[PDB]
Design an enzyme around this catalytic site. Sequence first.
Site, mmCIF file in Angstrom:
data_model
loop_
_atom_site.group_PDB
_atom_site.id
_atom_site.type_symbol
_atom_site.label_atom_id
_atom_site.label_comp_id
_atom_site.label_asym_id
_atom_site.label_seq_id
_atom_site.Cartn_x
_atom_site.Cartn_y
_atom_site.Cartn_z
ATOM 1 N N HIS A 31 0.681 -0.807 -0.165
ATOM 2 C CA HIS A 31 -0.263 -0.011 -0.167
ATOM 3 C C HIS A 31 0.834 1.513 -0.227
ATOM 4 C CE1 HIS A 31 -3.328 2.603 0.163
ATOM 5 N NE2 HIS A 31 -2.492 2.845 1.263
ATOM 6 N N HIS A 71 -10.610 2.644 -1.608
ATOM 7 C CA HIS A 71 -10.473 1.981 0.071
ATOM 8 C C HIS A 71 -11.619 0.940 0.599
ATOM 9 C CE1 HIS A 71 -10.433 4.209 4.327
ATOM 10 N NE2 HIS A 71 -9.620 4.695 3.625
ATOM 11 N N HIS A 73 -9.984 -2.789 1.301
ATOM 12 C CA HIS A 73 -10.068 -3.299 2.471
ATOM 13 C C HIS A 73 -10.723 -3.363 3.512
ATOM 14 C CE1 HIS A 73 -6.619 -5.190 -0.235
ATOM 15 N NE2 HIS A 73 -7.009 -6.123 0.254
#
EC number: 6.3.5.3
Length: 602
Positions: A31, A71, A73
């Site tokens: 990420h 967004h 997860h």
Amino acid sequence: KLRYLNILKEKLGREPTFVELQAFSVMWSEHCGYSHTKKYIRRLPKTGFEGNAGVVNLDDYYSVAFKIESHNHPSAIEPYNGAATGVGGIIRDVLAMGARPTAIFDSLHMSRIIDGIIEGIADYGNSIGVPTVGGELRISSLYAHNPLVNVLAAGVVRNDMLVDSKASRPGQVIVIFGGATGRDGIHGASFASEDLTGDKATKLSIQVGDPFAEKMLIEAFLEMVEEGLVEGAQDLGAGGVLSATSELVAKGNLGAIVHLDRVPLREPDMEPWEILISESQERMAVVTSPQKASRILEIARKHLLFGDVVAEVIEEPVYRVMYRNDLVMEVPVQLLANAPEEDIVEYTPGKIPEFKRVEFEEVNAREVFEQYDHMVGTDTVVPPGFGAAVMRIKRDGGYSLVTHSRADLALQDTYWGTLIAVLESVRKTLSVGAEPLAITNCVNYGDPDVDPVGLSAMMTALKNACEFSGVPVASGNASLYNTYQGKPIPPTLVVGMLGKVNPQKVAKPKPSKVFAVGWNDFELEREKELWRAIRKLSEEGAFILSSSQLLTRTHVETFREYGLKIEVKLPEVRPAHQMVLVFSERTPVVDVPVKEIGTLSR
Ligand SMILES: Nc1ncnc2c1ncn2[C@@H]1O[C@H](COP(=O)(O)OP(=O)(O)CP(=O)(O)O)[C@@H](O)[C@H]1O
Ligand SMILES: O=CNCC(=O)N[C@@H]1O[C@H](COP(=O)(O)O)[C@@H](O)[C@H]1O
Ligand SMILES: [Mg+2]
Ligand SMILES: [Mg+2]
């Protein structure tokens, strides 16, 4: 992960301390590190000042800052708070450029209509006062375990007030204001880099969110910019204080001495590392001269926000974390800011396939968008229900925004489905009279380690779509590891397109004859031939509609806003065609097929 731990041990010359582990576990997570996409993204054509937002000049006096993040997860585990916070974060990115947030655009991919996601977004954009001017919604049981929540935000900013996304000289300081720092979201960045069955898929990794705090943050920050107190800035999100501070100096190729004890707490028992990687919302990191720190603190406090001077910018490339006079950590700043890069594979396309039918539910539901008053078109030159959202900036100056994706096509051929999605995004922009200006995109993929080709195919197709169209990439995002106990989502690249258009020349609906203009099947070569026909007709005053379904329920709903009702004998179309619907008084004249199929009237 472990392949990375060795690399870290070799570079560090020994085994990392507890906090060193925690820190790199964030910065080197997919990420924050982008190990698998770094090289691909580099191969992409860029444009516009790219500083965690990407700004594009419109009239030399103003530029639009637009960026798309996701967004995913977080939303699979807490739909309401995961979506809201997603909005909160992307707004901070656009605001961090000195831009005034002027438009939100949603792109949902679910297996049913998850109210939570819809409301989380509507409520947050509503409490902060920034309108939703559009948002695609694709329903498929393929997103059952991994819903995709992508959000695009655009703001307008004066060319003379552009804020930098880095530190520029030793002696500067870094203030951190906004909401207080708590313990929510710690390691939420490491959470978004794994399969949803990970040991960090708990409510602890989820960020909270407070729009009233953000609206304040928007007012305060702009005041700081108006008085020229901001020399550089970065919003906080994944990695909290750590990510933000180390990244502002790595970019400038400087160093920093962070004092954790100066960071306003919302939970006084937290430990140094918790304060360092806490991912609490409504917080902004501003770089400035020592002297201006006084007025910035005053502005935020009177705005009901906390914050203090937290770091000192030093010329030495070191990242020294301090808690009082006790050293917490200390490592090479350029070590943190750079994760190990993975090799890429070269992809070579094949022939355009005979895409077959794979429908994505037609669950058109404005009922839910009204219940949570998720208004999508209150103050646009022409209603969004038609597609592109056109905003004014001047009487005869404006921009368009288009969010599109063809996961249905890509699911069958990652390359062609993606490439076609980018191209179709151009038809829409053209259909409303706008000049394609730039692109922000969000890559939604599963396991790169497992299927490296598919990722390669997405990036190659995106790269070839920009070379073929001449439209560069201003910014983007890349969400990987969107899988559940193995099963990955379809390769979904969401394209955000920005265009230039004179609002005085944007056509509106009126009683007229409808024409199917184009071909029923797809062929790359003649794509530029449709584009030329849309420009011609659009320039003549024609109202054009460029949908993949030609005509949808919303179009008809929106048509009734004008007391108009269409009667057309729609042509049979392939999954990927090269056709658009034209509405005019006389029969169109173009170097492309034209057929009178209906009428719009009353
Ligand atoms: N697919 C893509 N195409 C073009 N640019 C991309 C991209 N993916 C990422 N980028 C660029 O890389 C930059 C970094 O994104 P990254 O997610 O690592 O950080 P961030 O700036 O969003 C802060 P945070 O991690 O705190 O949310 C972006 O700001 C964007 O300009
Ligand atoms: O508040 C900041 N939001 C910005 C941000 O970067 N948030 C981080 O991204 C994760 C979602 O990533 P995805 O699964 O969509 O790839 C989320 O869990 C946060 O840690
Ligand atoms: Mg991001
Ligand atoms: Mg951010």
